[PDB]
Design a protein around this nucleic acid. Structure first.
Lengths: 50, 154, 98, 100
DNA sequence: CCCTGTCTGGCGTCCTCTCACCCCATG
DNA sequence: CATGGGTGCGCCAGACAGGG
């Protein structure tokens, strides 16, 4: 829902879900591109922490 | 011999990280310890001394290397690293020019109101460079002429 | 330039069916090269009405298949946008000729 | 007609789409201005290796509603007695009395 | 293995009434 | 325009080492 002004005051769960989906899309694209080992380890580790 | 390494930067300031890295090299004049810098990850041709490691992590807006450990960080691990880089470049340089369709061949439309629609080419005209394909719009087939680039081969 | 060829049976429907695409193209392109007459085929048939002999008694059946042309002149990128998937008159087979 | 007769047609339909119009190059190219020696003898004779009842000339023409042999019409695809009762019932889209 | 020290987690009163302020930053 | 990353609390308690 927005506030008086009009800027949408967004919830925290939307930040969390949007982070997980951004990272998951990045990880699918790197497994498409066949990135090396350390790149996809950091990518999966950032998804795990997300 | 200089081997490759992966550097993590603040994603978005990557060109400025690359420029500041070249400038820190030409400041602390370890010119014989750095080969190139390739572009959120920055590829660095390098050797491993602890002095050069402190140099790259003292470059601003750089988090650190990505490897097995932080004592002795890791070069690279890919069967075809050159082919992976070629695939990344091919993503940006996508040709996508499939349009060749004979009679009875299905095609795809991605231009004009007929975009996002498929159909078959009942007649073809290489001389006029036009394909005769109809689109199933509201059921009835809508025989329309589309260019090879205007439609994609299905 | 962009032709639209109409095909139907009900000639009392096709003049309104072409009018339904006239109004769909008038408010978008504002130049449509008329509802051209386009002569109609008269497929004639004859049938022995009896289930047997007396080949004198027959019945004649025909199907007037009416045609029209709309012929959108200019391909401004909003005319066809109001045409594709936005037509009507179930039973009137439509087709583009371009 | 006969339920025996309508079964023979669909059996001869199955031969006309499996063998013929697909293995029709046996006469299309090889029984022409090509090698007119007795290898062209193998063109005409291997055509006999396929069954006799497989040709599209063999599939006579039969109605689809009742299967009457004679009085067929290609447009409606069914027999002349069946096109009229469906004309008066209002089934063929557009048949009225041709009184020109 | 039997006791001893450390290291992290889990928790701490209820209703109300105003106020002020909510992501830069930038090629 | 849109995305991308301090240093003043105190007790209980059980799990994890650490001797013992």
């Amino acid at each position: 829902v927005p506030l008086d002004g009009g800027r949408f005051a967004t919830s925290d769960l939307n930040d969390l879900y949007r982070r997980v989906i951004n990272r998951n899309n990045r990880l699918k694209r790197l497994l498409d591109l066949a990135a090396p080992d350390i790149i996809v380890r950091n990518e999966k580790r950032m998804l795990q922490e997300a | 011999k200089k081997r490759w390494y992966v550097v993590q930067a603040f994603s978005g300031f990557e060109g400025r990280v690359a420029t500041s890295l070249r400038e820190h090299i030409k400041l602390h004049n370890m010119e014989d310890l750095f080969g190139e810098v390739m572009v959120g990850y920055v590829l660095v041709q390098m050797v491993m001394n602890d002095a050069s490691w402190h140099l790259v992590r003292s470059v601003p807006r750089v988090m650190g290397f990505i490897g097995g450990t932080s004592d002795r960080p890791a070069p690279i691990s890919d069967k075809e690293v050159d082919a992976i880089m070629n695939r990344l470049q091919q993503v940006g340089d996508k040709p996508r020019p499939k349009t060749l369709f004979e009679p009875g061949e299905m095609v795809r439309v991605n231009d004009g109101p007929f975009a996002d629609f498929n159909g078959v080419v009942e007649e073809v005209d290489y001389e006029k460079s036009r394909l005769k394909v109809s689109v199933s719009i509201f059921g009835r087939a809508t025989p329309v002429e589309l260019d090879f680039s205007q439609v994609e081969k299905a | 330039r962009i032709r639209i060829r109409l095909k139907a049976f009900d000639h009392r429907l096709i003049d309104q069916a072409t009018a339904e695409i006239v109004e769909t193209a008038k408010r978008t392109g504002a130049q449509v090269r008329g509802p051209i007459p386009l002569p109609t085929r008269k497929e004639r048939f004859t049938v022995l009405i009896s289930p047997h002999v007396n080949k004198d008694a027959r019945d004649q059946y025909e199907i007037r298949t009416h045609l029209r042309l709309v012929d959108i002149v200019e391909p401004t990128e909003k005319t066809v946008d109001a045409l594709m998937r936005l037509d009507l008159a179930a039973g009137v087979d439509v087709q583009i000729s371009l | 007609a006969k339920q025996s007769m309508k079964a023979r047609e669909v059996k001869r339909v199955a031969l006309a789409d499996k063998y013929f119009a697909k293995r029709a190059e046996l006469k299309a190219i090889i029984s022409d201005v090509n090698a007119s020696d007795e290898d062209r003898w193998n063109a005409v004779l291997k055509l006999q290796t396929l069954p006799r009842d497989s040709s599209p000339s063999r599939q006579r023409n039969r109605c689809r509603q009742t299967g009457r042999p004679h009085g067929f019409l290609r447009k409606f695809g069914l027999s002349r007695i069946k096109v009229r009762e469906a004309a008066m019932r209002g089934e063929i889209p557009g048949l009225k009395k041709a009184s020109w």
